[PDB]
Ligand binder design. Structure first.
Ligand SMILES: *[C@@H]1O[C@H](CO)[C@@H](O[C@@H]2O[C@H](CO[C@@H]3O[C@H](CO)[C@@H](O)[C@H](O)[C@@H]3O)[C@@H](O[C@H]3O[C@H](CO)[C@@H](O[C@@H]4O[C@H](CO)[C@@H](O[C@@H]5O[C@H](CO)[C@@H](O[C@@H]6O[C@H](CO)[C@@H](O)[C@H](O)[C@H]6NC(C)=O)[C@H](O)[C@@H]5O)[C@H](O)[C@@H]4O)[C@H](O)[C@@H]3O)[C@H](O)[C@@H]2O)[C@H](O)[C@H]1NC(C)=O
Ligand SMILES: *C[C@@](*)(O)[C@H](CCCNC(N)=[NH2+])NC(=O)[C@@H]1CCCN1C(=O)[C@H](N)Cc1ccccc1
Ligand SMILES: *[C@@H]1O[C@H](CO)[C@@H](O)[C@H](O)[C@H]1NC(C)=O
Ligand SMILES: *[C@@H]1O[C@H](CO)[C@@H](O)[C@H](O)[C@H]1NC(C)=O
Ligand SMILES: [K+]
Ligand code: NA
Lengths: 44, 367
């Protein structure tokens, strides 16, 4: 998941680098039930 | 959310509930972007036509929530606000142009399986994904219909972006580039929308390039909910990144008759004790303010207490300090130790407050 940071953690605090990855999904290689729906809208 | 469904547990761990203290009530959605910063809509905080103008002490931020109403002990976390920042060109008179606000938390929040921040998009992620017919996702605890129409659990729906000419021709309000709109069209035969109370929550898109969720918008406005040929409007996050950057850079580095009662001026009630002296007394479930004994306030020794809602009302609920509303119209104590944020030392919780043993012992204070 290549993500460059934009903010300074001195002011932003922590979290940026691992943003957007869900503990109960992405971090376990699981999909939510409707996640795919969104993927397919790009395939269009 | 109209025509959405129950969110799975852990599905939107960046979802933030804004919670008014007095009275105790859901105010809005918001989103978590780091351990210190929360994003939301400016009209949630400030909208003079509805006499809305909140300062920081008026609100709570509840994170990791799923149930609308249960106080989710050992899962949700409550954060207080250090400061609020509303966009200085926020146009509430006309448009809700730049319906955006930042909220800095007193202390960093502990992340967990349920609490975890969302990404903000860069120029390219925005460019590529913000395109008609691509779908994002919206979540919130708001109304289930335009016309209880309240969900017991966080709702979710996925909605396609709509192209400007159509958004534009759907409403007489001047649409700006700081907005976009989303939702199905009448002939598409699916339906869905944000509704009142979902404001401030994120519109998110999973990037197919790096598999991360990015907040592309903020639930902002619409006409009714789920109307045919009408479309919900969202604050265009990327467009306003300029400003986000600027506030975070600037402010982010932090963390005669004979009657003894004649004289009295009691807030609620006077009671005579002697013929020569009185006592200010208080309604059931209340007590005088220890240093301000002519004035009165809610009180609880215990782990839970009934809420003082307004009698004929079925709501308008107050709780004592250090308690929060809960299922059954009840105030339950907050556990400031499980929560974190209140005590660096060794913490013992207490009903209405806590004990912090600093390394001298503090009641309701840190070090
Ligand atoms: C109906 O009627 C009445 C009418 O008003 C009403 O209210 C009364 O209220 C008081 C409560 O006290 C007040 O509290 C309110 C807050 O609500 C506050 O506004 C106000 O300021 C008062 O504090 C009741 O009285 C109670 O209070 C006193 C004291 O709190 C208490 O007993 C006293 O104990 C003292 C010792 O602890 C004792 O005095 C000591 O004497 C020795 C020897 O002289 C001294 O020793 C040395 O002295 C030298 C100086 O010479 C110093 O150099 C040394 O250093 C001293 N030694 C030391 C060790 O320091 C001591 O210094 C002391 O002086 C004193 O004699 C008392 O016995 C008393 O027992 C009560 O608890 C009233 O009773 C009454 O209720 C009612 O409320 C109304 N109706 C109802 C239903 O209640
Ligand atoms: C503040 C939010 O809870 C709420 C979200 C509504 C989303 N609706 C749909 N269909 N997706 N926003 C509002 O209620 C805003 C705030 C002030 C009034 N308002 C409106 O959306 C009006 N219905 C229209 C409007 C009024 C004034 C300025 C702009 C738009
Ligand atoms: C909002 O409330 C504060 C606090 O009293 C006040 O200073 C300010 O003028 C108010 N602003 C608006 C726009 O109503
Ligand atoms: C809290 O309750 C205890 C006993 O349950 C009581 O004695 C005490 O006075 C209470 N607090 C107040 C301010 O009345
Ligand atoms: K407590
Ligand atoms: Na619609």
């Amino acid at each position: 998941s290549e993500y460059q940071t934009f903010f300074n953690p001195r002011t932003f605090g922590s979290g940026e680098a691992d943003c957007g990855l869900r503990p109960l999904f992405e971090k376990k290689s699981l999909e939510d039930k409707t996640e795919r729906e969104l993927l397919e809208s790009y395939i269009d | 959310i109209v025509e959405g469904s129950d969110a799975e547990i852990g599905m939107s761990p960046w979802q933030v509930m804004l919670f008014r203290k007095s009275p105790q009530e859901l105010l809005c959605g918001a989103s978590l972007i780091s351990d210190r910063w929360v994003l939301t809509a400016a009209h949630c905080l400030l909208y003079p036509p509805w006499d809305k103008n909140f300062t920081e002490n008026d609100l709570l931020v509840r994170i990791g929530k799923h149930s609308r109403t249960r106080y989710e002990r050992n899962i949700e976390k409550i954060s207080m606000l250090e400061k609020i920042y509303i966009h200085p060109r926020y146009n509430w008179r006309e448009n809700l142009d730049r319906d955006i606000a930042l909220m800095k938390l007193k202390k960093p929040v502990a992340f967990s399986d349920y609490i975890h921040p969302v990404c903000l998009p860069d120029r390219e992620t925005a460019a590529s994904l913000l395109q008609a017919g691509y779908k994002g996702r919206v979540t919130g605890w708001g109304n289930l219909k335009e016309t209880k129409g309240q969900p017991s659990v966080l709702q979710v729906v996925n909605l396609p972006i709509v192209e400007r000419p159509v958004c534009k021709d759907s409403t007489r309000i001047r649409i700006t580039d700081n907005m976009f709109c989303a939702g199905y069209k009448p002939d598409e035969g699916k339906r869905g929308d944000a509704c009142e109370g979902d404001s401030g929550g994120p519109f998110v898109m999973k990037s197919p390039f790096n598999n991360r969720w990015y907040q592309m918008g903020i639930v902002s406005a619409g006409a009714g909910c789920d109307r045919d040929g009408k479309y919900g409007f969202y604050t265009h996050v990327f467009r306003l990144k300029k400003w986000i950057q600027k506030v975070i850079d600037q402010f982010g580095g932090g963390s005669e008759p004979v009657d003894p009662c004649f004289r009295a001026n009691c807030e609620y009630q006077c009671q005579p004790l002697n013929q020569t002296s009185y006592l200010c007394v208080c309604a059931e479930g209340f007590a005088p303010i220890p240093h301000e004994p002519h004035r009165c306030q809610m009180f609880c020794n215990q782990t839970a207490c009934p809420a003082d809602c307004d009698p004929n009302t079925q709501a308008s609920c107050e709780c004592p300090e250090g308690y929060i509303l809960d299922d059954g119209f009840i105030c339950t104590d907050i556990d400031e130790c499980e929560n974190g944020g209140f005590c660096s030392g060794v913490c013992h919780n207490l009903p209405g407050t806590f004990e912090c043993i600093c390394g001298a012992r503090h009641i309701g204070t840190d070090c």
